[PDB]
């Protein structure tokens, strides 16, 4: 003579949602460092990310030309004129360390001690004084 249990939440969950959303889904996370998100979704979202990046770059008032302006596909071309260094991204964030300066007529190129320049770039970016000009 036990009355029938309704369990409106669990019933509505098991009615059409054939999964375990209304429960702790951190089994593979609390005892394993698995990838939470952005597993393969980045593949299709890369086009929209690049579009948004280009839109934000165009919207942001860039500095003068100064023979250092460059624009191409793929990402934001920092500078390619002559021997200028190249870089790209990865409010709005500001990434770095995508390429480097170019030279020729060796004497054997410079080694990775250039991190000093990268350290200064990161410090000046996190200072947020004027990223484009410096």
């Amino acid at each position: 003579a036990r009355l029938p249990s309704f369990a409106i939440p669990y019933a509505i969950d098991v009615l059409t949602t054939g999964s375990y959303p209304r429960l702790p889904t951190c089994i593979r996370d609390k005892i394993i460092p698995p990838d939470p998100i952005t597993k393969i979704e980045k593949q299709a979202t890369l086009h929209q990310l690049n579009q948004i990046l280009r839109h934000r770059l165009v919207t942001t008032d860039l500095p003068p030309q100064l023979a250092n302006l460059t624009v191409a596909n793929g990402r934001v071309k920092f500078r390619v004129e002559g021997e200028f260094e190249a870089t790209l991204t990865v409010d709005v964030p500001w990434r770095l360390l995508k390429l480097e300066i170019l030279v020729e007529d060796k004497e054997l190129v410079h080694s990775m001690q250039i991190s000093f320049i990268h350290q200064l770039v990161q410090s000046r970016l996190f200072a947020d004084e004027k990223p484009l000009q410096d």
Binding site: P21, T25, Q48, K98
Partner: protein, 51 residues
């Protein structure tokens, strides 16, 4: 019931933000704010092509 005449209706309940945050012996809450504007460009990954 149990084999009676049925109607293939569509059931669309509320499934926006369930109890997703892991709890420790009760006292849990929701954390899903659906920040699509912030999640537009937030996928920390490797720019180098590996796929």
């Amino acid at each position: 019931m149990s084999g009676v005449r049925a109607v293939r209706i569509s059931i669309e309940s509320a499934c926006e933000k369930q109890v997703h945050e892991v709890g420790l012996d009760g006292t849990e809450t929701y954390l899903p704010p659906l920040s699509m504007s912030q999640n537009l460009a937030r996928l920390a990954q490797r720019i180098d092509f590996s796929q």
